[PDB]
Design a protein around this ligand. Structure first.
Ligand code: HEC
Ligand code: HEC
Lengths: 112, 114
């Protein structure tokens, strides 16, 4: 499969419209810069040089990002309904700080 | 609103089950950002739709809401979210545009400026 014919001017305009809001194009934004993203190793490769942002992968991601993530990583986070579970997770996250004994031990581990 | 009573041990268990796959807990790599010291941190999506702005804080209520429905949280606080682009030709044109964002492409060469 090769990339079908297209219009890079329409492409730049569609990028302004649909992607610029969260993506820079400089070598500051919420999402990663999309400069030199073509054939670049995708960040979701770290989830658990995997996935390359080639033509097919760019077309599939843009069609349905959540489905793409689920299909290539195997899982995805769509939310936790149980309020108590989220409360417990927040209780855990509050200890992940430099002034809590648990977070102190974390700094110990990842610093050695 | 006050954070209701909770269990930090069950919290660690649930974190392992549901968040560790994409999130590290190291001081600062994983796909997502490290969640160490995320409490009261300025959320990354504060940079969305970038006159200085303090941004969104990951406090109790916001963490709970986001964990409930992340994409709904994003839509509510940013105003927009990316759920996909159905039209195939728009995607092909975007790919054509992105292929020019390199250090060796003319347009990419011009954009590269420091
Ligand atoms: C915010 C409202 C966004 C909009 C609009 C678009 N994207 Fe995005 N994208 C966003 C974030 C926060 C992230 C990082 C987290 C993640 O899910 O990966 C991304 C990621 C990408 C990537 C991956 C880059 C990598 O190095 O792996 C790509 C290729 C990408 N986004 C492209 C893209 C396009 C083409 C968009 C419009 C058509 C678009 N994004 C919109 C947040 C947001
Ligand atoms: C991948 C499959 C993920 C899983 C499972 C979970 N998260 Fe996530 N999260 C992921 C990415 C790629 C990103 C960055 C892009 C984005 O959409 O923001 C995030 C972001 C967060 C954040 C925001 C961090 C910040 O703004 O500094 C938080 C607070 C967060 N994630 C928490 C979180 C929790 C509590 C999860 C399980 C209960 C969880 N994430 C799962 C990818 C993935």
């Amino acid at each position: 499969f090769v990339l079908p014919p297209g219009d890079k001017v329409k492409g730049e305009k569609l990028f302004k419209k649909h992607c610029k809001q969260c993506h820079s194009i400089a070598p500051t934004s919420w999402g990663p810069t999309l400069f030199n993203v073509y054939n670049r190793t995708a960040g979701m490769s770290k989830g658990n040089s995997g996935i390359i942002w080639n033509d097919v992968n760019l077309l599939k991601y843009m069609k349905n990002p959540q489905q793409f993530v689920e299909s290539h990583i195997g899982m995805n986070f769509k939310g936790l309904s149980n309020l108590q579970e989220r409360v417990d997770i927040v209780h855990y996250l509050k200890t992940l700080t430099y002034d809590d004994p648990y977070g102190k031990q974390i700094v110990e581990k990842y610093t050695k």
